[PDB]
Amino acid sequence: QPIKLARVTKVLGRTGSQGQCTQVRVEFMDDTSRSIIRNVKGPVREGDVLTLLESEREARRL
Amino acid sequence: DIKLFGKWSTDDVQINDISLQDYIAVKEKYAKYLPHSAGRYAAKRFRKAQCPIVERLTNSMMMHGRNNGKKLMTVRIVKHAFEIIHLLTGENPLQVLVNAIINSGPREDSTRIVRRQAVDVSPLRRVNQAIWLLCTGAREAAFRNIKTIAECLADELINAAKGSSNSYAIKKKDELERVAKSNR
Amino acid sequence: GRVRTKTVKKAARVIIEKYYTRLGNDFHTNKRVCEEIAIIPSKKLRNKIAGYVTHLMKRIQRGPVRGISIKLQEEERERRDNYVPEVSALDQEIIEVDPDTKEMLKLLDFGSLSNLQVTQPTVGMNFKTPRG
Amino acid sequence: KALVAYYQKYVDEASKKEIKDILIQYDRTLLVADPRRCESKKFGGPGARARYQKSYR
Amino acid sequence: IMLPWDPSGKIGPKKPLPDHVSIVEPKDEILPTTPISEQKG
Amino acid sequence: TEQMTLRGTLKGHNGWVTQIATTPQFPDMILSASRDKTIIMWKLTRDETNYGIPQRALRGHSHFVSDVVISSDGQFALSGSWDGTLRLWDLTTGTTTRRFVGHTKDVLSVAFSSDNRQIVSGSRDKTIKLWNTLGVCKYTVQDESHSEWVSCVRFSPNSSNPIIVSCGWDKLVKVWNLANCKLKTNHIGHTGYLNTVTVSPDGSLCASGGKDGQAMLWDLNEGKHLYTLDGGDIINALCFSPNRYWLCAATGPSIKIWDLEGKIIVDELKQEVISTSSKAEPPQCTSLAWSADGQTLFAGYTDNLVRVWQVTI
RNA sequence: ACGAGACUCUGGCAUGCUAACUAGUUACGCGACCCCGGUCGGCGUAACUUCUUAGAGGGACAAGUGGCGUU
Secondary structure (H helix, E strand, O other): OOOEEEEEEEEOOOEOOOOOEEEEEEEEOOOOOOEEEEEEEOOOOOOOEEEEOOOOOOOOOO | OOOOOOOOOOOOOOOOOHHHOOOOOOOOOOOOOOOOOOOOOEOEOOHHHHOOHHHHHHHHHOOOOOOOOOHHHHHHHHHHHHHHHHHHHOOOHHHHHHHHHHHHOOOEEEEOOOOOEEEEEOHHHHHHHHHHHHHHHHHHHHOOOOOOHHHHHHHHHHHHHHOOOOOHHHHHHHHHHHHHHHOO | OOOOOHHHHHHHHHHHHHOOOOOOOOHHHHHHHHHHHEEOOOHHHHHHHHHHHHHHHHHHHOOOOOOOOOOOOOOOOOOHHHOOOOOOOOOOOOEEEOHHHHHHHOOOOOOOOOOEEEOOOOOOOOOOOOOO | OHHHHHHHHOOOHHHHHHHHHHHHHHOHHHOOOOOOOOOOOOOOOOOOOOOOOOOOO | OOOOOOOOOOOOOOOOOOOOOEEOOOOOOOOOOOOEOOOOO | OOOEEOOOEEOOOOOOOOOEEOOOOOOOOOEEOOOOOOOEEEEOOOOOOOOOEEEEEOOOOOOOEEEEEEOOOOOEEEEEEOOOOEOOEEOOOOEEOOOEOOOOOOEOOOEOOOOOOOEEEEEOOOOEEEEOOOOOOOEEEOOOOOOOOOOEEEEOOOOOOOEEEEEOOOOOEEEEEOOOOOEEEOOEOOOOOEEEEEEOOOOOEEEEEEOOOEOEEEEOOOOOEOOOOEOOOOEEEEEEOOOOOEEEEEEOOEEEEEEOOOEEEEEEEOOOOOOOOOOOOOOOEEEEEEOOOOOEEEEEEOOOOEEEEEEOO
16 A cells, blocks of 8 residues: 655644654645544644655543 | 865755755855854744754764763764765765755654554654654764764765665654554 | 743733823833833743733724723723614514503503504414423 | 955955855855853753753652 | 831831832822913913 | 735844834835834845845944934934934944933833924923924923823924924823924723824824724814724834725734724734744734835734835836 | 833943043053064053943833734
8 A cells, every 4th residue: 555645733632651653634745525534743834745655543531 | 166175165056845945054155164153043933943953063072971062073074075075976965964854854743642543753853853763873883883973973864865775764664654544 | 831820810910900001002111111011020920921812902902801991881882872773672662562561551651552552362382391 | 254344444344245245145154243152051960951850760 | 937028127027018019099189170370470 | 905915024133123214305215213212224136035235333322222213304213212312323334423311211102393493392290392303302291291191292294394203101192283383182982091002194083092902083173082993912112004994903913904984894814824823922013104105014023024015006 | 990011220332421549441651572663461650441340321112114903
């Protein structure tokens, strides 16, 4: 399966044990009406592009 | 006008991975002569991003105690590293750098949320780690060795710009991504 | 952390309450008004106060503010509240009315008015909210 | 700064401004004195923030 | 002892508490509804 | 019979623009103060892009420059500032000649004589100082002065009438005998503090304005309130036309122009591309001044821009 | 009401203020060296207070604009 790019469209809150991962909605670059919730390790603001090694995995909402 | 060490131009290089377009600062407004600036980059949260990656590399180099503060030691190492990358590759070494930041960044990393669930890295987290991995790639190669950091940092930036796997930074990166693949 | 304290807010309140006429939406004049009309013993406090004055004077230019009291009260509460339309909403030409209040007016002096159109009574007594 | 003050005094604002623009649009430090100073040491540590090794047991 | 405040500088200090925000009381004037010029000399 | 239009804006101020002073001599030179310490001597090229380009920043106050005014000569310029200093700007070189020390607080206004001899300064320390051009207090009013701030002081062009007018935050417009240096008459009647007062070129009638927006005309030959003008908003600056029979008032974000003869709104001068649409105050106006001829009026707003206003017909 | 804050000292700013042979600078002159300028913490004095010192002031308040919250 290929490696799909995705756009940080809203940064939701903060997840993890030590508040070590921001939770985020990512607008896909191919299908511009597919927006999934994904956990991100490290600093992220609105509109930065994440590379996903798979798009089938999906984070549980905090 | 003409740029970096008086001899490495800016409008030759292209950032391939659009993921790191804004987080690899090397282009037009981030064209400085030396990788040395007062900056005050590390004051508010993301301003770190608007630091030229050459200056981030320079800063990331001066590590393991004794070297902390010796930025001119590193400015020099980077200058002689780029000479070696040019004469071993025949290329504006800022492209070899940018290719190494693109290749040598991990794209998915494990985290403790049991055993360590896999999450995605921030692009800035990728640039941060990229530069860390290929700086530790240099200093660990160079430690207790006849070779200089000029050679070791160059060899690291070259092997990373290829993805050779002889690169410490590529080998640790695809190890992290292997452990991230595991817990998925 | 930039929250203002009571000694800043209470001052700013009482300053506006007594001297609304001299103040505006310009910090550097409000700052210089506070010098004249009050012994503020500290420049930092003098600015903090002036600064909250300006912030309140913006909130006064909008609708009314809770903990404040000015001379007019305040030309939308004294003057506008004397708003009255052409004819009142109680001047209905056809008043909707059920047969049961017709039954009680019939047992007053008001057996028959002209402007009372009695509806066909409501069928199937079904008004209570289901339990659980 | 001394150049920008020479183009202020002895020629028009026009030449001064397009110079000042070039300097600040490159690096702001050229015409703004970086306010940072070596923050003072406090007791109980070898410097400003850093504290000495705490010893339990 | 906490001393009082007096501007004389004898029983207490001349300087008020830094918290203390003494607001001078506004004297009441009748806002004029008749434009009046008062020439003299 | 006409409406007024933009010919451009004059960019080059960081702090927003205070009392703009025009000159009879040079039609190509406007000199504006600001809420930075700069005072820009402009160059009106009247080009496509910029109507005016700045030449010389008259640098060197501590705090805001309240008022500036040009001599009849056109080679000197004089500004009062909130640090409590009056300068006397050597307008050729761009330095100071002499500087007037004595005022306690913010010197709010300044004006010249016809001679360019006697200088007068309204300040927040509740006084008005009558100077020489050699920094000597000839006379200072404390006996019966304004009991508040002095937001303007103006001179009559009339030589036979040595008269000066002062508005103030005590709600009064006091008229002064320049000779005896004590008040000629009061003008009791106006409610609220005063921002501005101006004297028409004849030197017979003056116009005062404050928060209330009730622009009041007062005759100087015999003190009488002629008529009120409901400006509607807060009057920050008033300016008579040099040749026409027109009064021009900076009324909040807009400028309302009156014909004093036919008491009617001639026009109201406003910015058109209003991008403060969603819950934001538009760029307030605080100063204005007609040119030598009176085709172009310049007006300094709180967004730092000097806006030009041209007669079309 | 105390404590918090305010506060006091301090750090950063003002070619704006008062100033200076126990602090200097820029001019001018004499002099040493280089081939008209250049170097001088070589010497001496006229202006001046930019650097210097330390006093009085001013300066910043989320004050301005834009976003989610009775806004």
